[PDB]
Amino acid sequence: SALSLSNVAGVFYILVGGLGLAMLVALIEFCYK
Amino acid sequence: PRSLSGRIVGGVWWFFTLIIISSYTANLAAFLTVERMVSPIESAEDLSKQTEIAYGTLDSGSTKEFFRRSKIAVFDKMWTYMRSAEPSVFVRTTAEGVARVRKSKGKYAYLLESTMNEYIEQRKPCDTMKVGGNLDSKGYGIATPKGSSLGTPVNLAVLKLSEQGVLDKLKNKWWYDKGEC
Amino acid sequence: GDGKYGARDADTKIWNGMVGELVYGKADIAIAPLTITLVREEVIDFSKPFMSLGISIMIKKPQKSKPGVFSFLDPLAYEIWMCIVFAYIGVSVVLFLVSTNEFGIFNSLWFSLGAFMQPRSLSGRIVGGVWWFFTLIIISSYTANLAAFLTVERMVSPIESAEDLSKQTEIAYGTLDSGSTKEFFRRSKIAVFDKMWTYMRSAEPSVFVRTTAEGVARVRKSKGKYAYLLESTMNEYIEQRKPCDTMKVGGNLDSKGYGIA
Amino acid sequence: TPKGSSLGTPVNLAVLKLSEQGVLDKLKNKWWYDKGECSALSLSNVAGVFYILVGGLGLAMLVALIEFCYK
Amino acid sequence: PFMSLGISIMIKKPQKSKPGVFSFLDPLAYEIWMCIVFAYIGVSVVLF
Amino acid sequence: VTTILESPYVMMKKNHEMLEGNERYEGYCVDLAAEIAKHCGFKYKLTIV
Ligand SMILES: O=c1[nH]c2cc(C(F)(F)F)c(N3CCOCC3)cc2n(CP(=O)(O)O)c1=O
Ligand SMILES: O=c1[nH]c2cc(C(F)(F)F)c(N3CCOCC3)cc2n(CP(=O)(O)O)c1=O
């Protein structure tokens, strides 16, 4: 009976999703230049 | 500056760490609140699946002869250990066995009659405890000479006491109620 | 023939079942789970117990951890995740009015970078401070609230001894309607089992099941909110059948015995 | 009991016999308590910190509107 | 019989004491530390 | 024995339609009634006022 990785996991996916989102908005930045 | 690209990466990673360090801050407060305990020793099958915690029985007695004669899967592994265990996992008396657990910091388990086990658990200083179900199926009884006139009387009277709940009441009296734990 | 163990109808004064088929001359011996009760030892003879038993507690198999992502959206309620975003864009819009159509997009991209939390214009100065005081209370409350869930989750002790059943009431419990099991509690005078009977006697709805089978399904269809009490022999056997969703806990309640009659 | 009844004295005594024997106490416990029937959060608390926030937004929006007039 | 019994196991109860630099790795699980380092380098590789 | 219908002193038991006489009711004063009749020794029938 320790700490559940379940709850914490859901916040890992909004992160890597946000990383990919700004791996996307990053790629469009360099384009207009 | 306000580079809208990695601006949200800085923003989203911040939310990611806020939650995590809060989830740690929370669950740690619970660890310092309850501070529950666990005992490694569950069953007798838990004694034969490890070696770090030694164990033994009496050198001479029914408890010793049991494992020596037992031909059950789990119990077999226990006796093969005890017979050639170094140093001698066999103690001299019951008191020496309890003292060998009380002075091992939990590295020495002792196997005895479940009757005095529960009694030891209720004598000072409340350090030991029985764990798991008993290993066999025995029983104490009233002994009367063969062909006695007290034979059928006492036997029937025993059953009358148990169903009434006298025995259950009596054991609660000299073990737990007048126990010291 | 009748399919009963052994009883003595007080009216007709006639035994029935296996025990009966010994007395009236039909059978020579009885090899079965026959309880050595005093009422029988007077009329028939029993061998020594070939299996020491007693009454136990059949609880639901403690299902393994845990629910999913939905435990993250629970401490901070869904409604509060909303207002913190409305106010979020409600702050960055206030800051936006402190600083031609493209000049308000980079500043809004700068007021959103100052919003993605972590000169002396007294206007926007007291907006950043109040916001910090705002986000402070929320994350303090989140840590405090989530701590409670995880504090109790450590506190929820597994029901072990029978005395545990008596101390609480969140998990209801009962026995069979008729049989030696139920008759124990009603008659027992031990402190623990006393209160157990008192509760079960007045319990609504019925904590008593008709058949023994209705008990097992009632523990499997309560997800742990119900416990069934019965003989140890029948209990242990149940745990070794599909879907492996029940288990025996704690020691027995009494010291019975099966014997050859 | 009706005045000067036969049951007069014995009942009075018998009642008191039931007091110190604790059965009157036990009877009450039977029908009052024995037979009787008797991990989440909220928004109500959090709301009080939300209005001071928007209030801090409406005050600085006022300080924003007074700082452009001076300059 | 007037009291059923058998052979039992006696052990010593562990105290509250359990020092060592391990009960800090226990809350935030080992797997999470990995991904909090995997998504970590996953961030520094995004910004880079 | 005269008595008033009042909870939880004297209440109509659930299946009262099937019972007759005294078993019809139950409560505090109901159980008290018999206990009064025990240490005085008399038969009695409860009637509602
Ligand atoms: O009839 C017998 N009854 C016994 C009863 C008890 C007790 F539990 F105390 F009641 C004990 N113990 C004494 C101290 O160590 C723990 C158990 C030993 C018994 N023995 C010897 P064994 O069975 O040959 O080992 C018998 O023979
Ligand atoms: O001698 C007796 N031996 C019994 C043995 C068992 C079993 F465990 F299966 F071996 C059972 N169960 C059957 C299903 O319900 C649960 C227990 C009932 C028995 N009864 C009736 P009871 O004791 O009056 O309840 C006896 O009389």
Left (φ > 0), alpha (ψ -120 to 50) or beta: where does C33 sit?
beta
Pocket residue to mutate for ligand 2, from C9, C21, C35, most atoms within 8 A of Cβ: C35
Nearest CA of chain D to the CA of F10: how many Å?
11
d(CA C148, CA B34): 12
Q: Residue B38 corresponds to which tokens in the numbers above?
A: 């666990």
Side-chain half-sphere exposure of A3, counting CA atoms within 13 A? 30
DSSP C258: B
DSSP string, F15-48: TTTT--TTTTEESHHHHHHHHHHHTTT-----EE
- Helix or strand or coil: residue B64? helix
Q: Which chains touch C (3 or more CB pairs under 8 A)?
A: A, B, D, E
Position C7: which residue type?
Answer: A
d(CA B152, CA C158): 45
- Helix H, strand E, coil C: the string for C49-97 is CCECCCEEEEEECCCCCCCCHHHCCCCCCHHHHHHHHHCHHHHHHHHHC
Alpha helix ranges (H) inside chain C: 18-23, 38-41, 78-86, 88-96, 122-155, 162-167, 180-187, 191-202, 213-220, 232-238
Nearest CA in chain F to D9: F40
Q: C41 with B159: CB under 8 angstroms?
A: yes
d(CA C83, CA C88): 8
Side-chain half-sphere exposure of C137, counting CA atoms within 13 A? 16
- Helix H, strand E, coil C: the string for chain D is CCCCCCCHHHHHHHHHHHHCCCHHHHHHHHHHHHCCCCCCCCCHHHHCCCHHHHHHHHHHHHHHHHHHHHC
Residue where the block lists tokens 């004297």: F10
From the list C39, C42, C1, C33, the residue with the least C-alpha distance to C230 is: C33
Contact residues, chain C, for D63 at CB < 8 Å: 122-123, 126
Q: Are A6 and C150 in contact (CB < 8 Å)? A: no
State the angle between helix axes of B4-34 and C122-155 in degrees (0 to 180), rounded to the nearest 10: 40
From the list B112, B119, B85, B107, the residue with the least C-alpha distance to B41 is: B107
From the list C225, C27, D68, A10, the residue with the least C-alpha distance to B19 is: A10
Q: Tell me the ligand closest to B110's alpha carbon.
A: 1
How many Cβ atoms sit within 10 Å of the Cβ of residue C139? 17
- How do strand E7-12 and strand B108-113 relate by DSSP bridges? antiparallel
d(CA B66, CA B70): 6
Experiment type: X-ray
Beta bridge partners of C6: C17
First CA to last CA distance, chain D: 97
Position B104: which residue type?
Answer: S
Q: F48 with F24: CB under 8 angstroms?
A: no
Judged by a CB distance cut-off of 8 A, whether residue C66 touches chain A is: yes
> B137 C-alpha vs ligand 2 centroid, how far in Å?
20
d(CA C167, CA C185): 16
- Helix or strand or coil: residue C28? coil
d(CA C113, CA C91): 12
Q: Is the dihedral of CA C24, C26, C30, C33 positive or negative?
A: negative
How many Cβ atoms sit within 10 Å of the Cβ of residue D14? 16
Residue where the block lists tokens 């658990």: B121
First CA to last CA distance, chain F: 9
Q: B135 with E6: CB under 8 angstroms?
A: yes
Q: Are B30 and C154 in contact (CB < 8 Å)? A: yes
Q: Are D31 and F36 in contact (CB < 8 Å)? A: no
d(CA C56, CA B125): 30
Nearest CA in chain E to C54: E4
From the list E27, B39, B38, the residue with the least C-alpha distance to A2 is: E27
Q: Is the dihedral of CA C62, C65, C69, C75 positive or negative?
A: positive
Resolution in A: 4.5
Q: Which long-range contacts (CB under 8 A, 24 or more apart) does B83-90 make?
A: B85/B54, B85/B56, B88/B56, B88/B59, B89/B54, B89/B55, B89/B56, B89/B57, B90/B56, B90/B57, B90/B58, B90/B59, B90/B64
Q: What is the Rg, in whole angstroms, of the alpha carbon atoms belonging to chain A?
A: 15
Residues 6+ apart with CB under 8 A from C19: C5, C6, C7, C30, C34, C40, C43, C44, C261
From the list E39, B127, B178, the residue with the least C-alpha distance to A11 is: E39
Contact residues, chain A, for E27 at CB < 8 Å: 2-3
d(CA D16, CA B105): 60
B57 lines ligand 1 (CB under 6 A): no
Q: Residue D64 corresponds to which tokens in the numbers above?
A: 């924003």
d(CA D13, CA C233): 54
From the list B66, B11, F6, the residue with the least C-alpha distance to E46 is: B11
DSSP string, B102-123: HTTTSSEEEEEEHHHHHHHTTS
Q: Which residue has a Cα nearest atom 14 of ligand 1?
A: B94
Residue E15, φ and ψ in degrees, nearest 5: -80, 180
From the list C159, C186, C181, C182, the residue with the least C-alpha distance to C170 is: C159
d(CA C224, CA C172): 9
Q: A18 with B7: CB under 8 angstroms?
A: no
Residue B163, φ and ψ in degrees, nearest 5: -70, -30
CA distances from D25 to D14, D22, D32, E22, F37 (A): 15, 5, 11, 56, 18
Number of helices and strands in chain A (H, E): 2, 0
Cα dihedral B12/B14/B15/B16 (nearest 10): 90
Q: Are B134 and E26 in contact (CB < 8 Å)? A: no
Cα dihedral C33/C34/C36/C38 (nearest 10): 150
C179 lines ligand 2 (CB under 6 A): yes
Nearest CA of chain E to the CA of C55: how many Å?
14
d(CA B150, CA C184): 29
